[PDB]
Amino acid sequence: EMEKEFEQIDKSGSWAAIYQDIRHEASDFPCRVAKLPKNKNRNRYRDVSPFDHSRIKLHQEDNDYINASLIKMEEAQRSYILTQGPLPNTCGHFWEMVWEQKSRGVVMLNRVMEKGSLKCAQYWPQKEEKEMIFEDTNLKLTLISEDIKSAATVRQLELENLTTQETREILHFHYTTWPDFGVPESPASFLNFLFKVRESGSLSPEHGPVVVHCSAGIGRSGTFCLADTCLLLMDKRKDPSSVDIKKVLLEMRKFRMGLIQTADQLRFSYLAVIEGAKFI
Template sequence: MSVIEKDFRKYDETGSWPMVYQKIRNESSLKAIADGLTIGEAKKPENRSRNRYRDVSPYDHSRVILKKNDNDYINASLVTVPEACRRYILTQGPLEQTISQFWQMVWEQKSKAILMLNRTIEKGTLKCHQYWPMGEEHGSIDEMVMEDVGLKVTWIEQEAMHDFNLTTLELEDTVSGTSREIFHFQYMTWPDFGVPTSPAEFLNFLMAVREYGVLEENVGPAVIHCSAGIGRSGTFCLVDSSLLLIEKTKDMNSFDLMSVLIDMRSYRMGLIQTPDQLRFSYMAIIEGGHQILADKNSTLDVVSSYIANHEDSPPPPPPPVRTTSLSPQHISNRPPPPSSRPPSRKTISRQNALEPTTEISDSVDNRLTPEQEPDEDPSSLQGDEQHNSMYAVRRRKREDRKKNTNEQIKRMKEKQRKSELRFRRRDYIRPLAVGLAILLGGYILYRYYWKY
């Protein structure tokens, strides 16, 4: 049994995950102080509006520096794991006012992929602005033009997998006319501050991403984000790097997992936000590591332990039985590699991309209410009539979702406007009150000295 497995069992049996997580936080803080890490650029007044959260800032030594504009700041960090030959750009979910800088970073860093580990709206809160075109077939647009940085993003196609969507985009420099293909992976079932349903589900996603070669050393670093760019993003990077170390050494005892995480935290603060995310990282690394080493004995033990510690909630589905090592050709529901794709990508995709994407969205949290139920059962129809009916139902559901999303965004903007107005009024009232107090004090002193 490896050290990682022994630690996992010990922390599970003693219920000490919160203490282990706190120890990592403390050691990371001490290391940051000892190394003299600063966040001066993030705290400059002109950059505060570019940060989604006040307590998540990139370190000055590892922040990504923009090249084209006068202001070179973006809330993004270059995280490197030299032992695994990995580089990642971890960033926050783009704000409405930082979309141009986000795409400028993708272009300048020569990234081939964007890994989005969140939804734009989670639990009724806007977690990330819609920064990429979703295509007219999905009730959105085909192109986004950012004149301030001279870039244009064009939707090419979308493929819906079991737990994620893969969108192919074209990023063009409008000045030079050169363009690149960008793969946008959006993991749809990873809750904020939570963990995926099972390690097997997550490993399927990881291996599908790897299959496209977007994490390799010979290409620009992949851009990875959730909402803050530290919790889910940190979990992904830790698991990917650790499994790569196991692949290189063929030994699960060849590295210290805690040290890897603490070193990663010296590039971007706060990676992995909860004890549950830390625990899940161990689970995914153990399962993935044993698949790499062709050891089929530990998976059931790990999953059984997971279920035993989550008896109050519905148990996750068990991982699929694997009899071979963890490699791309054995991953189910994976997208085809780029070389096997049909040449006429745009024409084919716009005929087929709609149905699977709508099906995935509806299966998670966009189910029809009784008022939205279809008037007739599409299964009772035949041929074109059935297809047209299903298309109409899906189009109506898509329009309803778009309307609800717009209403949520409108309410949040109105709430933000009222909040800003309240603070503005307070800024006006405060000096007025101070002035009146000074006048009153002066009058009292005048009356006192005039009397005596």
């Protein structure tokens, strides 16, 4: 059914028109805290901000702000934290959020350098013997293991609260092969990555929400969560044909602005859900 709709949109070439309707219908909520002058250096992009009502608050007393949003999908029973690629000054905030929200997995959909410029700080250690200390938030991060593949890379990290000496194992899932221009022609490797994150148990309700990010945390990050939620809904509803990707995306945009940044990313999201449902 969804495939029949997909081909009809492709034949008429209505992806730009459908995507523009989504932008027009999307929720508009204030981002007052994100726009405070003291938080200018905590935002990577001036036009991408978390809504006040869904923003993740740090448990510190000075400044609790981080550019991160909690997406709670009620019917699908999944929660995600969508955030920007950390800045050199917000890497300690990032791991503070991971600790306080009790996240088990971190999903990275970008490379540190894309389009010939920096898109994300090197917020995790590349070498086991060179651990990272975040002095502002009192956390230690150690690379425990790294399993590299052609399209992705899974790392085991140890995050330590230096105040209590508690340690947690964080799984870091890095998708490294998103094309420099446009979207992938096939959703196969992106779906393989999603199924790998699922298989790890990082999305389980036993854990805090998975942290998902790209550079701005709305484009590829939106595609990841949209596909995962739609696949969940198709497996849970009695009538799996009733899953409307546009409705699900609009629901997600109640929690973070701008999810899915292009009409090509919208088409790719449909493609990933259709092909992901066939494999499931």
